[PDB]
C-alpha cells in the first residue's frame, strides 16, 4: 500500500492539477487556500504551494464556524465534518468565487465540487456538476482527464 | 495566527504537561508521537516538541490500519475514527506501553486514556480511568487534578 507521507505529497500534486483548470473572475496575487475540519493528508498542502505560473498558494486552517470563509478563502480543502458543520461551511461559501475540494468522497452529494479518494494505489477524484455550476469560478471540463487517468490502472 | 493555530499551540502545551505525569517501563531516548486519523490541532505536535527534561518528541502521522502501532509509537494522538477503525487501532495497541490521547472526547467512555476538549475559551480534558489502569504506562495520579 501507500504511506501517509506518500499520499500527502500526492494530494498536494493532484490539487495543483485541479487548480490549473480553474479560473477566478478576479484572479488574486496570492491564491488563498483554507483547510477546514480534521484532515489526514493536508499536511503537505499546509507548507504553501506554487502554481506553474509562479503564483503562490498560501494555506492555513480555519474554524468551520468562521462566518467569512467564502471571503478569506479562494480554495477550500474540506476535511471530516458533520451535517451541521457542512451546512455552515457551504452557506459561508454561497455567493462567492470559491473552489471546494474534500479529502473524502462522501461530501460530493452535499456541496463539494471535487471529492478525493486517497485509498488505493493512486489518488482518484470525483466531481459534482450542481456544486461546480453554482461555484462562482470557471472550471474547464478537461479537469476530468486527470480523474480518469488517475483511475486507470 | 488564526484560532486554529493558537489552539494548535495550546494543544501542544497541554500534551507536554500530560506527558510529564507519565512513565515508560523502559524510558526511550526519543519519545515517539503518532498522529492517527483526521485531526484539526496536531499541527503543533507535528513540528516536533521537546520535554522539560530535554527529550526530543518526534511526531509523525501514521495510518489507522498500520498494524505495528503498538511498537512504533510511545504516545498516540487519535483523530477522527469510526468504531471499526477505533477497535482496530486498540487491538494494535493492547500489550504495549502506549499513552493515548484523542482530539475529540465528548464521552471518554471507550478508547483513549485522555480525551481533549479544545472547544471553549480554554482547552479541557477528561480521563478514562479504566484505559489508564490497563495500558502499560504508569500515570502520576496528580494529573487528574489537571482534568475537568
Ligand atoms: N517523579 C518521578 N517518578 C518516578 C520516577 N521513576 C518512577 N517513578 C514513579 O514511581 C513509580 C513506581 O511506584 P512503586 O514502585 O513505588 O510502587 C513509577 O511507576 C513512577 O510512577 C522518576 O524518575 N521521577
UniProtKB/Swiss-Prot annotation, chain A:
Disulphide-bridged cysteine pairs: 34-73, 108-115
Binding site for GMP: 23, 138, 140
Mod. after translation: Cys-34 and Cys-73 form a disulfide bond in the oxidized form but maintain their free form in the non-oxidized YfiR structure. The Cys-145-Cys-152 disulfide bond is well formed in both structures. The Cys145-Cys152 disulfide bond, but not Cys-71-Cys-110, plays an important role in maintaining the correct folding of the protein.
Disulfide bond keyword on record: yes
Annotated keywords: Disulfide bond, Periplasm
Taxonomy, superkingdom: Bacteria
Predominant subcellular localization, coarse grouping: periplasm
This protein's record includes keyword Disulfide bond: yes
Activity regulation note: TpbB/YfiN repression is released through an YfiB-dependent sequestration of YfiR to the outer membrane. Binds vitamin B6 (VB6) or L-Trp at the periphery of the dimer, and both VB6 and L-Trp are able to reduce biofilm formation induced by YfiB L43P mutant. However, VB6 or L-Trp alone may have little effects in interrupting the YfiB-YfiR interaction. GMP enhances the binding affinity between YfiB and YfiR.
Subcellular location: Periplasm
Effect of a null allele: Deletion of the gene results in the generation of a small colony variant (SCV) morphology in PAO1. Mutant exhibits slow growth, reduced motility, a highly aggregative and wrinkled colony morphology, strong attachment to surfaces and strong, exopolysaccharide-dependent resistance to macrophage phagocytosis. The deletion mutant, although suffering from a tremendous growth disadvantage, shows characteristic persistence behavior under antibiotic selection and during prolonged infection in vivo.
Consequence of changing residue 61 to A: Forms monomers
Annotated Gene Ontology cellular component terms: periplasmic space
Quaternary state and interactors: Homodimer. Interacts with TpbB/YfiN. Interacts with YfiB. The YfiB-YfiR complex is a 2:2 heterotetramer.
Role played: Negatively regulates the activity of the diguanylate cyclase TpbB/YfiN, leading to decreased c-di-GMP production. Inhibits TpbB/YfiN allosterically, through a hydrophobic interaction between the C-terminus of YfiR and a conserved region of the periplasmic PAS domain of TpbB/YfiN. Under reducing conditions, may also act as an YfiB-independent sensing device that is able to activate TpbB/YfiN in response to the redox status of the periplasm. Part of the YfiB-TpbB-YfiR (or yfiBNR) system, encoding a tripartite signaling module that modulates intracellular c-di-GMP levels. The system is a key regulator of the small colony variant (SCV) phenotype, and plays an important role in biofilm formation and in vivo persistence. The c-di-GMP produced by TpbB/YfiN stimulates the production of the Pel and Psl exopolysaccharides, which promotes surface attachment, generates an SCV phenotype and confers resistance against phagocytosis.
Protein name per its UniProtKB record: Negative regulator YfiR
Full-protein interval shown: 38 to 190 of 190
Curated annotation (Swiss-Prot), chain B:
Phenotype seen when the gene is deleted: Deletion of the gene results in the generation of a small colony variant (SCV) morphology in PAO1. Mutant exhibits slow growth, reduced motility, a highly aggregative and wrinkled colony morphology, strong attachment to surfaces and strong, exopolysaccharide-dependent resistance to macrophage phagocytosis. The deletion mutant, although suffering from a tremendous growth disadvantage, shows characteristic persistence behavior under antibiotic selection and during prolonged infection in vivo.
Keywords: Disulfide bond, Periplasm
Cystine crosslinks: 34-73, 108-115
A single Gene Ontology CC term: periplasmic space
Free-text description of this protein's post-translational modifications in UniProt: Cys-34 and Cys-73 form a disulfide bond in the oxidized form but maintain their free form in the non-oxidized YfiR structure. The Cys-145-Cys-152 disulfide bond is well formed in both structures. The Cys145-Cys152 disulfide bond, but not Cys-71-Cys-110, plays an important role in maintaining the correct folding of the protein.
Compartment annotation: Periplasm
Activity regulation remarks: TpbB/YfiN repression is released through an YfiB-dependent sequestration of YfiR to the outer membrane. Binds vitamin B6 (VB6) or L-Trp at the periphery of the dimer, and both VB6 and L-Trp are able to reduce biofilm formation induced by YfiB L43P mutant. However, VB6 or L-Trp alone may have little effects in interrupting the YfiB-YfiR interaction. GMP enhances the binding affinity between YfiB and YfiR.
Positions of transmembrane segments: none
Keyword Disulfide bond appears in the UniProt entry: yes
Record-listed GMP binding positions: 23, 138, 140
Source domain of life: Bacteria
Entry function: Negatively regulates the activity of the diguanylate cyclase TpbB/YfiN, leading to decreased c-di-GMP production. Inhibits TpbB/YfiN allosterically, through a hydrophobic interaction between the C-terminus of YfiR and a conserved region of the periplasmic PAS domain of TpbB/YfiN. Under reducing conditions, may also act as an YfiB-independent sensing device that is able to activate TpbB/YfiN in response to the redox status of the periplasm. Part of the YfiB-TpbB-YfiR (or yfiBNR) system, encoding a tripartite signaling module that modulates intracellular c-di-GMP levels. The system is a key regulator of the small colony variant (SCV) phenotype, and plays an important role in biofilm formation and in vivo persistence. The c-di-GMP produced by TpbB/YfiN stimulates the production of the Pel and Psl exopolysaccharides, which promotes surface attachment, generates an SCV phenotype and confers resistance against phagocytosis.
Subunit structure: Homodimer. Interacts with TpbB/YfiN. Interacts with YfiB. The YfiB-YfiR complex is a 2:2 heterotetramer.
Protein name: Negative regulator YfiR
Lineage start: Bacteria, Pseudomonadati, Pseudomonadota, Gammaproteobacteria, Pseudomonadales
Gene name of the record: yfiR
Amino acid at each position: 500500500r501507500t504511506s501517509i507521507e506518500q499520499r500527502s505529497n500526492a494530494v498536494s500534486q493532484v490539487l495543483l492539477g485541479i487548480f490549473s483548470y480553474v479560473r477566478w473572475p478576479k484572479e488574486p496575487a496570492v491564491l488563498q487556500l483554507c483547510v477546514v475540519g480534521p484532515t489526514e493528508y493536508a499536511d503537505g498542502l499546509l507548507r504553501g504551494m506554487v502554481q506553474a505560473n509562479g503564483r503562490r498558494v498560501h494555506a492555513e486552517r480555519r474554524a468551520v464556524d468562521n462566518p467569512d470563509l467564502g471571503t478569506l478563502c479562494n480554495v477550500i480543502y474540506l476535511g471530516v465534518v458533520d451535517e451541521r458543520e457542512r451546512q455552515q461551511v457551504f452557506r459561508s461559501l454561497a455567493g462567492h468565487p470559491v473552489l471546494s475540494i474534500s479529502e473524502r468522497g462522501t461530501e460530493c452529494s452535499v456541496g463539494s465540487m471535487f471529492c478525493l479518494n486517497v485509498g488505493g494505489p493512486r489518488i482518484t477524484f470525483e466531481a459534482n456538476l450542481d456544486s461546480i455550476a453554482r461555484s462562482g469560478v470557471r472550471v474547464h471540463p478537461s479537469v476530468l482527464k486527470l480523474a480518469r487517468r488517475q483511475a486507470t490502472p
